[PDB]
From a paper:
Autosomal recessive inherited loss-of-function mutations in human PTEN-induced kinase 1 (hPINK1), represent the second most frequent cause of early-onset Parkinson’s disease (PD). hPINK1 has been proposed to act as a master regulator of mitochondrial quality control, promoting the elimination of damaged mitochondria via autophagy known as mitophagy. In response to mitochondrial depolarisation, hPINK1 is activated and phosphorylates ubiquitin at Serine65 (Ser65). The molecular mechanisms of hPINK1 activation and substrate recognition are poorly understood. hPINK1 is distinct from other protein kinases due to the presence of three unique insertions (Ins1, Ins2 and Ins3) within the kinase domain and a C-terminal extension (CTE) of unknown function that bears no homology to any known protein domain. TcPINK1 exhibits constitutive catalytic activity towards ubiquitin, Parkin and generic substrates in vitro.
The crystal structure of a catalytically active fragment of TcPINK1 was solved and refined to 2.78 Å using E. coli expression of a cDNA construct encompassing the kinase domain and CTE (Ser150 - Asp570), and possessing mutations to reduce surface entropy (Glu527Ala and Lys528Ala), a 10 amino acid deletion in a large loop (Δ261–270), and a phospho-mimetic mutation (Ser205Glu). The N-lobe of the TcPINK1 kinase domain contains three insertions: Lys182–Pro192 (Ins1), Glu221–Ala253 (Ins2), and Leu260–Met288 (Ins3) and in contrast to hPINK1, Ins1 exists as a loop remnant in TcPINK1. Ins2 forms a small domain containing a βi-strand (222-226) and an αi-helix (231-242) followed by a loop (243-253). Ins3 is disordered and is not included in the final model. Finally, the majority of the TcPINK1 CTE (Ala487–Leu556) is α-helical in nature, and rather than forming a separate domain, is tightly packed on the E, G and H α-helices of the C-lobe of the kinase domain (3747 Å2 buried surface area), supporting previous data on the importance of this region for catalysis. Although TcPINK1 was crystallised without ATP, the kinase domain appears to adopt an active, closed conformation, based on the positioning of the αC helix, activation segment conformation, and the ‘in’ position of the DFG motif. Ser207 phosphorylation was also observed in the crystal structure. Inspection of the structure revealed that Glu205 (the phosphomimetic of Ser205) lies only 4 Å away from the tail (Asn287) of the disordered Ins3. Instead the TcPINK1 structure reveals that a highly conserved aspartate (Asp381) within the activation loop, an arginine residue (Arg336) of the HRD motif and an arginine residue (Arg216) in the αC-helix, form an equivalent interaction, which is further stabilized via interaction with basic residues (Lys212 on the αC-helix; Arg240 and Arg241 in Ins2) and another conserved aspartate (Asp366).
Numbering used by the authors:
A (entry chain E), B (entry chain D), C (entry chain F): 156 to 182, 191 to 260, 271 to 274, 287 to 494, 496 to 515, 536 to 566
Write the structure that this text describes.
């Protein structure tokens, strides 16, 4: 594992009362985030959990000292998120003192070029926007498959690699508000109103903000990130996020008719996908796995599958998947497809095909 | 760094829908400007950038919370303006809630006595006017040297310290419209017509207002504040700003013959400087570094340098600069001279000498 | 707050070089006055102060842009006039561009049916005239109570709602000459002769016109609207305004014997009030609060209070006030009484009683 001794720091990227991010390299394409006071004596469990959660995507842990019982319990209760092109790259996590220049938690990450809101200050291609949506959906599908909910998706913390600015790579980052417990997965008992519910923010899903507490009384997050993707899809196709601003829809009120129409540039099928995602009732919304397939099928299927027409065969699908595997053996395009093939199960690709047919 | 806890508020100085300014002190010579809704959820990026830009002259930043990515990207993309006597003193910037009596941006500043248009409600000395012009020029020279353009210079936001009312201290304030980006400096790609171009106002320079958009198609701001100084110099010598009023010259139209002649009370050399600054073509206008020098030389050079006569020697110039440093080791007079010595490069003081000789 | 987006224009009511008034409605009972060139760059402060003053009765302010320093200085020096039935209803004031069809000032007001001079083109009932006079007085008592002087009261800008033409509602309008400063209230330093003194017009009170300038040398406006009311009372009871016409008394000369006698139709008590109001010396004039009570007592007191007789008791007064409060729980009649009860203090209702007794 990489620790401090293997790397050289540069200029600060950000400084704060609660921590610092430094540029870094091995001997400046890395960022080393340091969160101070990772110590049960200097902070309560709520804050330590939040610091640890940031570590949910991490590739390796390293520890100098004997782990404290609270550290142990945190680790043993946590679902791990495997690597994925659309999830932030966190290469190492270690604990360490403020020598080597407060017990401090350290995270070594890839440096990204900008966030999504910055990249959208200039309107991208309509094709670029579909790739962005596709990657965002693919990241959400990967989290949900592994019983994790981000709970704080927003423009601000989707991070981009803008080599080839016509098609960037998008990653989900900042897992400090995430749900990742082995015990309860994506369903969370909600008994007191003063309980951690994710980011108490604009893009919390209606099924989370609206829920009243009680005795199970559960909060279900299995489609909650998807709702926020819907909002975010607006920003991705050049419009205001309907739920941001001074004249501003709210997750708990909004009637589905209040939602602005999307520009005519953005395909009809995709408009429907966005409208699906933004359904208040989670039962009415697509599975993440299926919603991701919709975007991929739009991007890569035979055109006959997309036009009303249409004979779809189980054997023909598998042939088409294999044509795709050979096609990748335009770096984003490769990533999406491999990402798509990694999870393609025959059932769900038909579900997505059937959904597309019904929306024309 | 100073935060709210260290200071005590008094009467409001200004009250508005978008923010409030309060008189303040440490334990009422400070002003604490508060701008509401410094939140990506309650306002769009263009408004937030405009709030942050106001911060460009700040001496210290302090943050309670962990910086959001937009805040980080803003901070890292921004050119900083070092302290300077003719630039507004902003001692602290901090982010904070509307308690402590909306996430609000806060600016702790010096309180100044009035603006330039109020001070010029009674005609000042002709000597006072030259000190005013020198200070303004010296401020613009400092901005331009650091790749920053104010874009909204005007009587209304030039602020004065009127202890010793025969000679006040002038400062440039209200950096809300400024250009201060590390990436592009003073050259700004102008691709869409619906783009922030600075204050879309009377004293935008001809080279900015007249430029049509395209594909680079660049806006060059490197002499644009200087044009505004020219217009403002009229107000400073007791005339109407040629570009203000109902019967009014317009930056885009005006031909150089349309400009009113200045009063005979204003030295001939200074009349020419003003006529230079107000040239339509930025290539015909002096560098800021040179234009500031013209005013300084008028003020402090040996009289032989100013009369037609005149042997000027590289060694003699340096001797004269060193005579000045000793002379400052009438507080405005000290500040201007030290301001001038700080930036004096030998090339530019000769250029300024040569320019004065050619205009008599 | 209401802005342009909330309302739909109709026909112009008036057009000019300096601005426009449009009929308007929310989705034509409103008027939207627009004054152009509300910009320090297109007009001098004098003209802006006069545009801003028009806004003194306004119920809400709204500003799209960051307020300029001259705007700020205006707002913070200005006394606000709370709503009142006899003061023009201005629902919103906002600043905006001349697009959306010049920075322009916008005032959204109630439409009224006519002015006083038009309404008096046919002689009204002697009872109608007392209601008019009472409302006028009530408006003045409200202004003086909040340290504001209109300084341009005249038939031309008293505006009427003429539903139930037997009894109309009168409002004082057009506050563009008014004195409304926090600093000095109704006493105004008068150091130069070229100083804004209100409408420099026929109904300026003798104490204002006759005052020579100096070093305090103060103009006292506390009984000055009252004087104009006196003149206007003639118009209200079917006579020529003594101070209007080609054969014409002047506010600086007129001897109190020169005032025409009022018609025998107008009560003797009311003749005396008018004569009191038109006394040259403001110290011999009734307080506005008392003068307004005189008219009210005439209209609503027990008849025994008005005839020479008369036992008046502090407890009995209060009982009578409460009898009035019940009587209002003929819409003008309601308004007058509520207006009178809102301000009735026991001291001043006895002062008025006492004054009525001494004038028979
Ligand atoms: Mg041990
Ligand atoms: Mg966090
Ligand atoms: Mg501003």
């Amino acid at each position: 594992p990489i620790t401090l001794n293997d790397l050289s720091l540069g200029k600060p990227i950000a400084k704060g009362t609660n921590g610092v991010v430094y540029s870094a390299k091995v001997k400046y394409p890395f960022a080393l985030k340091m969160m101070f006071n990772y110590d049960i004596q200097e902070n309560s469990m709520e804050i330590l959990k939040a610091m640890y959660r940031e570590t949910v995507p991490a590739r390796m842990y390293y520890s100098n000292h004997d782990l404290n019982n609270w550290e142990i319990e945190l680790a043993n209760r946590r679902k791990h998120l495997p690597p994925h092109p659309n999830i932030v790259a966190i290469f190492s996590v270690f604990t360490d003192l403020y020598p080597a220049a407060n017990m401090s938690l350290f995270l070594l990450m890839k440096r990204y070029d900008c966030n999504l809101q910055s990249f959208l200050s200039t309107a991208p291609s309509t094709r670029t926007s579909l790739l962005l949506l596709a990657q965002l959906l693919e990241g959400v599908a990967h989290m949900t498959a592994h019983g994790i909910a981000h709970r704080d998706l927003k423009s601000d913390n989707l991070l981009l690699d803008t080599s080839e600015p016509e098609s960037p790579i998008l990653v989900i980052s900042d897992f400090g508000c995430c749900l990742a417990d082995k015990t309860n997965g994506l369903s969370l008992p909600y008994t007191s109103y003063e309980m951690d519910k994710g980011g108490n923010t604009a893009l919390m899903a209606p099924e989370i903000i609206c829920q009243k507490p009680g005795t199970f009384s559960v909060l279900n997050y299995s489609k909650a990130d998807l709702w926020a993707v819907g909002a975010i899809a607006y920003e991705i196709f050049n419009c205001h996020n309907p739920f941001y601003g001074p004249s501003r829809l709210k997750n708990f009120n909004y009637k589905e008719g209040d939602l602005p129409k999307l520009p005519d540039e953005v395909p009809t099928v995709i408009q429907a996908l966005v409208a699906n995602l933004l359904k208040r009732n989670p039962n009415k919304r697509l599975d993440p796995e299926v919603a991701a397939n919709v975007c991929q099928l739009f991007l890569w299927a035979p055109s006959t599958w997309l036009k009303p027409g249409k004979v779809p065969t189980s054997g023909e699908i598998l042939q088409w998947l294999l044509s795709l595997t050979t096609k990748v053996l335009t770096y984003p395009e490769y990533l999406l497809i491999s990402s798509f093939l990694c999870r393609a199960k025959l059932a769900n690709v038909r579900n997505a095909l059937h959904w597309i047919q019904e929306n024309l």
